[PDB]
Every structure is written in structure tokens, then in C-alpha cells.
Amino acid sequence: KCVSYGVAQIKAPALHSQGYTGSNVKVAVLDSGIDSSHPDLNVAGGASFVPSETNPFQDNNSHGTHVAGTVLAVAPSASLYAVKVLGADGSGQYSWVINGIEWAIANNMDVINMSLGGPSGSAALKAAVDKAVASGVVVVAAAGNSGTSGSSSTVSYPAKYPSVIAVGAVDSSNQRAPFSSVGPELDVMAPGVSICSTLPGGKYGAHSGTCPASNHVAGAAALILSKHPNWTNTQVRSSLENTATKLGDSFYYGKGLINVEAAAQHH
Ligand SMILES: [Cl-]
Ligand code: NA
Ligand code: NA
């Protein structure tokens, strides 16, 4: 298949070898669904809020299935939930996403991954992610793939909301990917170039984006909570941000590349 490096790059193998693989951590993938038929994917539960696509365990896009593979690669023992808020074409309404956030809160998810976003949000979308973080959920989002706009932030919503961890993409050499959105909202980087993960119908394929980068961070959160089940979302986020491997300027790199090994020992 594609060969990939991302799991090693964030130093997840260190935690796996100590017995920390994300067991009893609930991770909600708010995406195009998850193909649970994939032999490498073990999905704990699901809900679809896409009214024309009723099966959250069928992914007609393939984006949600790629997210799942990357999260389970980082946190093999995580309980993954398929929250379908995006259709086949990869687009959804903000009300579908809000319904998936509400579902994640109600069902005691530890982590939300939103591998999505647009250039504008809404009060109702901000209320939803703010409410999830108030409830103690770790919320992670792709920073966006809008490159640079001189002085302007190009970070998408929901990542642009202070409550949400905003993740940009680096390559295997820790260089910012030219597509990775920029701005003071940027928190951390993770592997986002040619990420090999699961695709529907038992396949594998590489994808580049801030979405695969956010998937590494959602996984890292689950590893941390499988060592520190007592930690608040506040402590989880602070551990990832404060032990990041410093790279370039924060506008481009935030705090740098997540190091889940370091994060799992933060004091
Ligand atoms: Cl369907
Ligand atoms: Na399966
Ligand atoms: Na944010």
C-alpha cells in the first residue's frame, strides 16, 4: 500500500509500548460516516444527522473512513463513534454538525474530531463547540487548507473558535505544508502530507490535508486520557500545546509538532 510515518512522528509508539493505546476513551468522528465493514476498523457506535443518508456506518465520501484509520492508528483501543454530519459530496449543513456535537455531549464522548469547516461559522455553531468544551469534551479541528493571505488569518471554523484546538499540517521533515492555514488561532501541527489510512471497501490510500493532521491530535488526546483518565479537557489541551516540539513562527506553526510522549508526562 502507501507507507506512512505519522504515528511514529508524534511519538505514539512510546505510549503503546507502556500499555497506553486509548482504551475506554470515546472519540466521535463528525464526518461523512465510517465504513465499519473495513477489517481494520472497529466502530463502537454511531448516529447519522444527514437526512438523505441514514446509515452512519456507510461512507459514500471516504473522508470519514480515512479519519477513522488515522485515529485508530494513533489510539488502537479507542472506542470510535461514526457521527455522520457530511453527505457523499463531503458537504453538510451547520445544523447537522450541531446535531452531531449535541449527540457527542449527550453520549459522553471524551474527544470530538471535526475534520471539516468553512470560511464562516455561526453563533449556533460556536454555542455548540463552546458547550461541548464546557461539558469537558476535547474538541479538535483541521486549521484548514487555505494557504496564506498575507497578514490575514486563513484558519477555518470551527477551528478558528478559541474553544477548539486548531491543527495545521507538517510533512515527515516537520516543514509546514504549503496548503496549511495560518493565523494566531493555530495551536499545534501534526503529520498531514501523504497520510496512508483506510478507505471504503477494504482499501488504503494517502491523503494530504489539515484533516489527517487533526486526526493525529484526536488520537493523541485519546492516548493521553488512557494514561490520565482523571485529566480535564483543559489539562489534555495544555499537555499537547505546552510540550509541542517548537518549529517556526506561531502564525505558521503554532506551538509546533505535538509530542504525545512528552504530553503524557506534563505536570
Ligand atoms: Cl447511507
Ligand atoms: Na470492521
Ligand atoms: Na481555535
Numbering used by the authors: 2 to 75, 85 to 277
Paper text:
Despite extensive screening of thousands of conditions, Oml-1 itself refused to form crystals. Therefore, an omniligase-1 model was constructed by superimposing the sidechain W189 of crystal form C (Pre-4 and Pre-5) on Pre-6.
Mutation A225N in the S1′ pocket and F189W of the S2′ pocket increased the synthesis to hydrolysis (S/H) ratio and overall coupling efficiency, whereas the I107V mutation was added to S4 pocket to increase the reaction rate.
